[model samples]
Target: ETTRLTATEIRARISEGAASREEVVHEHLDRIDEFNALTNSFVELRADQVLEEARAADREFGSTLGGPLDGVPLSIKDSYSVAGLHRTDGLPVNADVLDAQDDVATARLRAAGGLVLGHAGIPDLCIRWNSVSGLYGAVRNPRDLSRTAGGSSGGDAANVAAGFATIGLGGDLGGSIRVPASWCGVYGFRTGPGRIPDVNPNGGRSRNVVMELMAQIGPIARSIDDIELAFRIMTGVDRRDTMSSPLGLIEPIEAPRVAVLRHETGAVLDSSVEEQLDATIEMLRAEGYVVEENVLPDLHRAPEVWAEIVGTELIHRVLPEVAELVIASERMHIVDMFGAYELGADVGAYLTALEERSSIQMTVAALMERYQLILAPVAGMPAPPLDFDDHIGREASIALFDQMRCVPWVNLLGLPSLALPNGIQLVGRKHDELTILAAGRAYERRAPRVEIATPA
Candidate 1:
């Protein structure tokens, strides 16, 4: 029988000899072989290498080398550099370039004896909400192949939803991970920036200010327990990522107070999504937790400010040099002017943008004094059609960015946000992932299990 066990349960089975490392690895690889073509979920599948690793893990049983994830099968986002594997970051220019070293998260998982099955597909440069690369076509939703899985990390969500993997590793910047998780009906967490090591050997060494402010590496899972296991394993400080904090080891808050923000400050939630959010709130309330609806201060300015910060960083610092390199290398056919739009705002307009971000951060920080958690909608709409190419070009990109107003604020404020299925957002205090996970676990027990669609 196919086991729908969480990472924790699987680990127990592995430890007690009820399940072999080879069994788990083969199970996932078979599932990938069956569904990968339909979902467009994986960038590359390391079948032989994964089986070899599983063999080694089986031999090392009861050894100190075995970490909590030992012998578990999992998938990583293509944006993360795994030693000996190509690290594309979904850009055509960097396609098929192998990493000189492993990203910290990948290294951590490998050290724990987790078999790396493959890297999931991502949008070009991991920028857009829809997962499409010039190299690999768009990733499709497992629930309904006609609809998009959603985002830069959409492939990760698709893989998990299709039963290709029990847990997935993905990064969130402007809701890359969360959007897909919601659309795919899975659990995804955006840990506080710098909580997980962000080193990328293919990208070279440098401090990422935008990521420091708004990007985070976290987990996506079908079960909340799997998410908890992945987060615990992924968290820790690394000297490589300067922005990563040493505070991840702190204790979790118990029965935390929560505030619900159904609609963002400026954008309206889609009616169906709003109903889902309300249902989630009622579920939480029924569990005996405090739940209140209130509009967060500065919610309206979050999208504009997020655009400003990301645009300034991408335009002034990264894109010009990247475009020139891509052109010089003959990797890109043409450098469109739209590539330089900076989310539709020029450098001169960024002055007001920075101030607005600061104001939102401060306001949210103060509000946290009364509430330990904020519950909100993951997105205003359900997953768009799989062929939804609306995120391409300048106008489409801006429209997509406007729709992500609710998610990026947590990144801007440098706080942790957990995205759950059916469009639920669990916003936690700064560096307080434990509280978020606890609340998420409670909801997971109550929420209905999402059914996976058979591959066409």
Candidate 2:
């Protein structure tokens, strides 16, 4: 019960006499040890320091434990720069460059009294669809060791799915949040860009304009309530990130209009993935919400555009200064994906893609305006084997990328979207995370929560 407690439940328990912050933190640390071997889920852990924080929280709250997330334990992905912790984004250079401040999201979680356990691992610069690096190695799926945990944020979901942490801090540049959450059977979000901020606490992390235009950082939790709580806590006025919007009064939609897209153009999904999407639609329809089949026209084009733009930007724009920082193995994983797209020394080509991205964004946003929420697949297949996308050559990578078509579109759009258990996700208009959240909740309340058991 303790390991499975939602953040809200943990908070309530700590507030009452039922549990102590120290007790809960210690429990999580134990679980972390047991599961760390199953998936190299965490890159680092400062358990002793965290126990001290938990004690300090006890003293601060004494007889009155109350903060939005008072004394609850959480973990941040290595993508974030947490003060006094290793800020390596799974790269070796600058591995000793300690950060002096937390990213806005990390700071906000700490401010709400979250006792962070440590940092989870991710692919280099979050480049791949699976979390692996020369530094931290691969993070395996808790559901099945042979299968992938899903990338970029793969380790984030692994930790939470294995009950190592209550919620995990994850970033979504291109399906980084949803893909892992889908594979790991957790709830995750790519909150709309600017809604959170452009806060980059890492000296080694990417500074690409493409990421600025396309990326989002947010929480990955096991339950919708926890997702809502974490999202609300991390959002507020932040001066550091210029892209951040001031937190205004939340206008929640009670009964959201929903649209379901089972497949995109030329997308071939495995039966279980297709069945899960179909089941999710019926779950929504059963919950008394209007559900209709709708095609996200040119939907497949976005992830293709995502590959072309991200590959071109990383290879041409961001790599020269940072290329030396990456290990040869991790470097090859990136360049291989780029080779599939045949990226080159063409600034004009990159610029034109950026221009096309703008037109696509405007058109997509206008289309999404007709519905309050859009439900789509996170991956065309269920969690594939670990290292499923590795060394497959350009032709195989193209097909696998098409399977991931739904994920990067949200990133390209910079729109809020949430990945639920199984392979379905809810995408919303920019900054309308509440409606997106509520729609997910509508399904969540009715549907049986399905997650694979931790491997024996």
Candidate 3:
């Protein structure tokens, strides 16, 4: 009975003595066993580790106390190295390696008394759209195993969707987190770059300008409340990551004006996805929020701009050395397409586009002064077929990136965006995640319940 609850609900149950930490852990472990083969959601499952942590949390329940997520079982993407867990960013080179220290997000989650159930799989270097790696294979969608769950966070999405974990921690660059969430029908957030710290040794000190620009670490979960809870707990400045803001101490704005953009400027909209988004906007309007269908200036050009910048940074500067490793490996396809972009096709064109990105960022920032939240569709389509890859070889890996035309602009402008269930994406002003969360929670209450996937 207690198995079908959100993280907040489970926390309340433990506090009120309606559920025990042991019981919660057992249910998750059972779920993992039942569904792990079909979904390939976990790269590692620390059964003993989670049980011991849960027992410790129960012992301290009424005493000194832990934190909000005390005893909650969660899964982390393998890209975020945990001290003892395997930290393979789906690369074959580091398949058997164990991390020496914890990444900032994992450390914070542990400090909050969250139990790490295991490591979830990510695509190679967290670059691909589908969560498949030669090291760990593909992470299939729990809803329809034939379809992809969306990658680099595909395992996170699959695990959360399959009920293997109550919550999941994942990172996003170029819609990595939201794409998986959209495909899997879960709630996920991509707090602006540096909003959550990224101190992974794999990336080495986080000092690179390109790393600072686009990548963000955040949570993935089944409910809006869980996403809000994780965001509230995980946000802050970490000395390890210089790009992290020291401005988290600032209080969030209350009941601010919101601007809603129904479509990504000039995006080829899928009717079903658009209908759901439009219905969400109408509902928000009925709630007295100032919702608008106005075109966000220059948004149609955002995908090209974001791709140009990220491609230039990763291809031209970051991955030249790594390309050799990828090419020599059996899974050379990951490198062949992604690595080729760096070899230089149109440097001048990318530079011009990069300059234009700044102008578009300023335009959106000016518009944010009028609206607190912008509502839009996270993707053009619902979950693509599992074999969608057959039709779109390398393109399947980039479909989420292509269709998530709205999210990258947040990274471009350094503002926060939260993607929720029912294909709704909440765009908030910089460091204003609380407003976006509140709006999401309100919307979730009115939205119809998402159907949970059942075993075949």
Candidate 4:
């Protein structure tokens, strides 16, 4: 099916005159219609606007694709602002709201000729890992309908996994991109802080302490090349985003030292993920790279500190507002998720956590001085059942967070990490995405290819 082709392949076909832009877009739209019911990954579809945009691209580009992503279909997350599209952020009350202008990343993707396929779903307030919302329901895994797609970027991964879009745009705060990408069998990249602008004009958590410190705008796709292409296009300093940076150039590591870890405190490593991690280490060794198995300094403390700040914020700041905005069922789920944590707003503790974060980042930087790349699992297990989040009580929910303990550490230190479809990750130094992508591409060649999921 044309929908199965990667953005790179689609661009080549369009430029070679073997496929028309209209046909490509229509084929993806058709696939979405055929399979969207199974996973409910996509919350909205502006078919008319996308079709017209495809026709316009066909007219303008003719037989030679002009833009890097010319004719590629893009699935924008509901949390992102896309001009003329609704910005629900997975809240029922915001369903009627419309975005007058694109967020920085969205505008960049459109400028690169990405055809928008409308909004992907998310959890209420875009907080939980499971993509269930009062507005969009649960986003089932395309790989298996009964399993979760993983959120809050669950819909983004599912759309790409189901072949409804060639690429997906998402944000990563506590594995929003990597977790779903791992569960859905696709590539998701979360860069270091300030590498990508995350501002939204309509509404966003702009200037929020956690968001400014930990979150990033990134790409999810079936192909690493596609992820790298989108990353290059959407990155760079934007004056509108105060957190954005110049992304100073750096030299590639010579004879790169790779660090690999398979276990962490309070986290269980499932046998399947352990096997994959072992295989990845050997694979890199065979390719003439030094692969050492070592834990990062303050590895266990990473998630703890993350919880201290983000979890505390949710308790004091966001949940109070979410109380009035969310429906009963949504309220229950959010409450249960938050109940798993021991969150508090002790001013001294918050300041201490912030101070510890700075120390952790410095020590991790020192560790990076020895190792250019860190290989780890995206999660302890495969996608959990769809109802896994509902009523999972406090201890289980904390265990669930332990399963994803590897993810938040990257966000904590503000380093780039790439999650491969096989469920392992590649971590790089700040603003050094090239090293991770290069290594991931090499590893991907040896790994099994990810296919479009056929939901039952």
Candidate 5:
């Protein structure tokens, strides 16, 4: 039951002396011990180190505690650098490799008194939406073991969903954080790039310009409050990230209007998902929000643009290195996904796609001038089977990308968004994460709380 508590609630108990940091961490670790076999959410748990940190917190701090996240347990996605922790990156080749320093996000969490519970699993190379790893194996959806937890931040969401951790650190490049958070029935926040200081100590393969423009380090948690807390703690301009912005945080829109996108071209929302979305829309109306059905500009072209940029980058640059590093099967998997694009990345074609991306961003920005938020499905459908993408080949892979049509546009535009546990994501303009978080918090109050997964 202690593992069921949100980070905010746990912090209250820690401050009130009703729960010690050590006791809280023990309960979460116990939950991981009990349920991790069913989910494989964490690749490696820092049990000893975390317990020692918790003990030190108890000894050092009185009832008031050390910091905002003092004693809060959190999971770090394998791609991020965590001091003294091996970042497998879901590859068997680097399974034993350890990091000498923490990425900005992880460092900030620890400095705020967060306990690093473990490194969460990822899809091989952290490129896929399903978190099947060669190193740590498949990360199943804790809500239903047969279904995917979602990836490449699959393990982070599962860790939060199964109570292995109260909060998680994840990176998003194409729907990684949002999709997993949605499928696992938790909250994930993808802020605009540079807002959180996207720094990776090992930047060799990840240095591609295409990925740098779209990728972000974000938070996954059961509650929006916790996500906001983690977001604030981790945000600042760092010289390490050349794109890191010095933009100041802004307030949520007062009397905001929302554009509700019910469907995506070439994709259909499941009837049940549509119903849930409808109910949430009504709930928002009841809360006095002005909601309207509207389609995003150049929506169908969004995913194609994403594929053009990343697929071209992979083919022309990254994949050769990836081929040498991963196993044959994983290599095939990457090829299958990339083959969907079959792009010839000539300089002219690439620059044209870049120009088109800017057009899309400008159009969306203009739309947001009238509507402060966009309410959309996290995926076209609910969580799929664990092997949804396994050996599925190119056409099926394209279809899978179609299912995620609602997601990629945000990445392309460099906007902030929040994935609610109910499979809905609220998106905001660039640097306007507060509005989406505020909007998500409103829905969070109306919707049923996400409970810890109890896998049989």
Candidate 6:
């Protein structure tokens, strides 16, 4: 627990002559060395590179520690292409292939003083929620080695939860970022697209294709303060990303109005999930914010609409290219997830699905206008067993889908969301990271502090 200090604390200590950056880096590397093998949290270990960076950071401690996060060790998802690191994205075949250039997001982080510890594991093409990938091996939850750590970004979450690092860079096209954080009892942000600029956020792809339209690149941390710090420095209108635009001045709101959605489109809330959400709402009310228990508009139709877009694209575009690379089980799970939608939809149906998606976005927009944020369970149940994904039958897939009912619609709506410490998430309007952060800050202040997870 001695190494559990926040990145803010580490930076301050190094700045004020309390500790050396090299010492901190060496400490974290030791932790990764001792415990990371159990979770397979890291795909590669760059101890030499990290030590080099730390020595440089010590020299520059006189000059503001190189930047906000100078000397702070951090992990990158393998899906993110950092120069000289492998970029498999869970496809084992490409594990040896080094990236020729840094993805736009990774470049910005490196430039801002983030010392890259190494690349963490990610799901195969980010297909499943369970963090089992062939290249880097299975990712086990820190709390329970048999349980899942949550996927695509699961390894990053596991790494942070296990005290290997304090900050992580991850993507959220579906629930990749938020799900893992919630399960691991950490904070994660899924900013609306365009809030953060990334020309090649996808590991191998450079353009907005398949899930790209809804995908986002953002930060993950154990605390809201760290998330806010990382988010502020990385977001901007970079010239490289066509969709990037300037962020609006954050309009502050005191006692922000909140809407609580206890049930969702695809799944029913589990009893434990409902109880926890109820407790959160009451805590918010006791803290003097106006809280309302209500379902979101157009939420009932979210699952089908979201599936139509993601499913159709996967079948028509992605699989053909990576079919040889992925295992059969995952390939089937991905298909079973949205393949039903693909089975029945024709071209006209596809076009109509677009119109429905627009309406859903408008509906959520109007809903957010009335209430600053929406509260919901990130998943209906806590992280399940790792083997739960090995043979995903029809019933099992539906069970999994129902548990994650509250997610994915945010993708359809392109809204900003923050994952909380209790497996809950606060979703807000487009580009409203400030709103969610403010709410999260309030929760951290008012709610009872709880243990995050085991540091195994």
In the predicted model 1, the residue pairs found to clash are: 129-151, 146-386, 147-386, 148-386
* TM-scores, all models, native as reference: 0.90, 0.94, 0.89, 0.96, 0.96, 0.94
Kindly report which residue stretches of model 6 are placed more than 4 angstroms away from their true locations once superposed: 60-64, 201-203, 206-210, 264-266, 343-345, 448-456
Rank by lDDT, highest first. Answer: 5, 4, 2, 6, 1, 3
Model 2 C-alpha RMSD vs. true structure (Å) is 2.0
lDDT of 1 by residue, 307-369 (tens): 667766666666666654332211221122223334444555666666777878888888887
Please provide, for model 3 over 208-297, each residue's C-alpha lDDT reduced to its tens digit, 9 standing for 90 to 100.
564467678889987877887787688888877777876763355666676666555555567998788878877776776777666456
What is candidate 6's lDDT per residue for 1-456, written digit by digit as tens?
A: 325878788888777877787788788888888888788888787788778877876775553666777767788998788877877778768767787787877777788888888888777888778777777678888888988889879998888888788788898888889999888788889877677887654445565443566788888887788888788777888876776888663755766799987764656777988888888887778777788885555376786677778888778777878878887767877777767666353778777888888888787788788888898888888887887767777677767777787888878878789988687888887767787888888778876543435454
lDDT of 5 by residue, 81-105 (tens): 8888898777778877888888887
Clashes (backbone N, CA, C under 3 Å), per candidate, total 4, 0, 5, 0, 1, 0
- CA shift of 317, model 1, Å: 5.0
List, residue by residue over 260-366, the lDDT tens digit for candidate 4.
Answer: 86665345788999998998888888778899875555378887787777777777777787787765645665555554553566778778888988998898899
**Which scores better on lDDT, 1 or 2?**
2
Residue pairs with backbone overlap in model 6? none
Per-residue accuracy of model 2 over 104-193 as CA lDDT, tens digit each: 888888888888899998887678888987678889988888988998898889988888888899988888899998899898888886
| Candidate 5: worst-modelled 10 consecutive residues by lDDT | 201-210
* Stronger candidate by lDDT (3 vs 5): 5
Q: Name the better of 2 and 3 by lDDT.
A: 2
Q: Evaluate residue 299 in candidate 3 and report its C-alpha lDDT on the 0 to 100 scale.
A: 74
Model number with the top lDDT: 5
